[PDB]
């Protein structure tokens, strides 16, 4: 429960980690939180606040809602980061080439995803722009929940396609392996 600036440890005893600002060989905390230690390599200390509002970091799984679908890309708000819901919402875009690495040219945005769905994807890279970039290439990544164009909740039938129960209509979208 150390306040910002408690003298956590000498640099020799421990290694800098998230939540720690090191100045003058005396590591210090940078946030008000409960400390932890990981324990060749020295140990690493960290301080964590009790919503974290973490910035998206590359290679992290994210759950996100598609504002719009566009020919060259998909525009998706990054609603949640794994285990931390985001009070602060950052937009994220998914490329056509990124949605499915197999059959790249055949992959089309309209068939892969549809507005209002919730998708699970990694962060391919930082924005290089206002909008961060994400990719659903991995088989596990896919639309986890969807709302039909009719408005009926859709239950998955096959990996390529989603079925609307009452309509009996099937819409094509990438769905998650897990």
């Amino acid at each position: 429960l150390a306040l910002p600036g408690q003298l956590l440890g000498p640099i020799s005893k421990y290694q800098p980690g998230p939540g720690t600002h090191v100045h003058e060989s005396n590591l210090y905390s940078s946030l008000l939180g409960t400390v932890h230690v990981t324990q060749a390599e020295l140990p690493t200390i960290s301080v964590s606040a009790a919503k974290r509002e973490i910035l998206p970091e590359v290679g992290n799984i994210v759950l996100c809602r598609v504002i719009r679908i566009t020919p060259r890309q998909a525009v998706v708000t990054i609603l949640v980061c794994g285990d931390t819901v985001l009070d602060a919402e950052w937009q994220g875009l998914i490329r056509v080439q990124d949605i499915r690495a197999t059959e790249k040219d055949r992959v089309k945005v309209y068939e892969s995803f549809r507005p209002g769905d919730i998708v699970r994807a990694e962060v391919i890279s930082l924005g290089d722009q206002a909008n961060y970039y994400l990719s659903t290439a991995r088989n596990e990544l896919g639309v986890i929940l969807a709302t039909s164009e009719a408005g009926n909740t859709m239950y998955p039938v096959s990996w390529r396609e989603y079925r609307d129960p009452i309509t009996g209509l099937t819409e094509l979208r990438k769905v998650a392996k897990p």
Partner: protein, 311 residues
């Protein structure tokens, strides 16, 4: 899967439904919204008065997270400055002016949603629409209510024919530090409370100075008429057998976001007869004639609790 809290931000509306109409559970199964307060339940008002030293009258109203700070500032307007002044007749020996308060704009309210108030409302931007529409609403109600008399504000010369040298002008400004509940409901009650706390200084014109003067150690209290208090609610509909309709009273911000129809009723019980000073419904077909009437019963109950809060 049901990752706790992670689920809510996604698919918010359905989550409210499950809690609203619980499936058969080893529980009372009372309809509990995400707020934790039943639909008939209401946020608890808490009012504390006399906080601001600089203002003539001060009042703080809290409805859980939502908070309003109201201050009454008194200014003197020379009768000569106001356009269209006509000396009043104390008694008459059938034509009605627009109103001494209206034509002279003697009361100037303004409701100011803080930039701090909500993630939604932020600074450096011209006023948000909800903030402006609420301000006029308070203005309109104050003149229709006749809460503050026009006569009390007048300043009289008292020559040893008597004449009015000026009208007291009462400025009411309100600031929300936080906004998680219905805006208007908290504000109006705060305005009435603040006006009650108002203690304008006794003022006398000095003939030699030729300037209106106020006297230290002199205290007069504005006479408020009635105690109109309001309750507002919004309907939640399961649509995105007619779709189920639930009435939600004193809504939380999220509920305001996922509910498209609202109602606000202003009622006074002081006379001993239920009196509806103003009603407003928008955005839905739920609030039929039968629902409107019976909302006043919830309002009456809301009025009865507020007077205990407001001494």
């Amino acid at each position: 899967t049901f990752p706790r809290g992670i689920f809510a931000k996604l698919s918010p509306h359905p989550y409210l439904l499950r809690t609203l109409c619980p499936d058969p559970s080893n529980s009372s199964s009372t309809p509990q919204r995400t707020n934790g307060r039943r639909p008939n339940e209401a946020r608890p008002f808490r009012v504390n008065l006399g906080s601001l030293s600089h203002a003539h009258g001060s009042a703080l109203v809290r409805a859980g997270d939502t908070t309003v700070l109201c201050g009454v500032r008194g200014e003197v307007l020379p009768v000569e400055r106001i356009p269209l002044f006509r000396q009043p007749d104390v008694n008459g020996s059938a034509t009605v002016g627009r109103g001494e308060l209206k034509e002279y704009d003697l009361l100037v309210p303004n409701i100011e949603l803080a930039t701090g108030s909500a993630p939604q409302f932020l600074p450096g931007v011209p006023p948000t629409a909800l903030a402006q529409t609420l301000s006029t609403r308070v203005y309109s109600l104050l003149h229709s209510t006749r809460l503050v008399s026009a006569e009390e504000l007048r300043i009289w010369y008292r020559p040893v024919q008597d004449r009015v040298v000026a009208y007291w002008v009462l400025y009411i400004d309100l600031v929300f530090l936080s906004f998680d509940g219905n805006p208007f409901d908290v504000a109006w009650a705060a305005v009435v409370a603040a006006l009650r706390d108002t203690k304008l200084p006794v003022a006398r014109w000095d003939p030699d100075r030729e300037m209106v003067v106020c006297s230290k150690t002199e205290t007069m209290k504005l006479t408020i008429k009635g105690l109109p208090i309001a309750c507002s609610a919004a309907v939640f509909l399961e649509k995105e057998e007619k779709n189920r309709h639930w009435i939600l009273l004193d809504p939380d911000r999220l509920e305001e976001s996922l509910c498209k129809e609202v109602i606000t009723m202003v009622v006074d019980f002081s006379d001993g007869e239920t009196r509806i000073r103003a009603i407003e419904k928008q955005g839905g077909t739920v609030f039929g004639r039968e629902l409107i009437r019976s909302f006043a019963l919830v309002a009456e109950d809301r009025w009865k609790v507020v007077k205990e809060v407001m001494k």
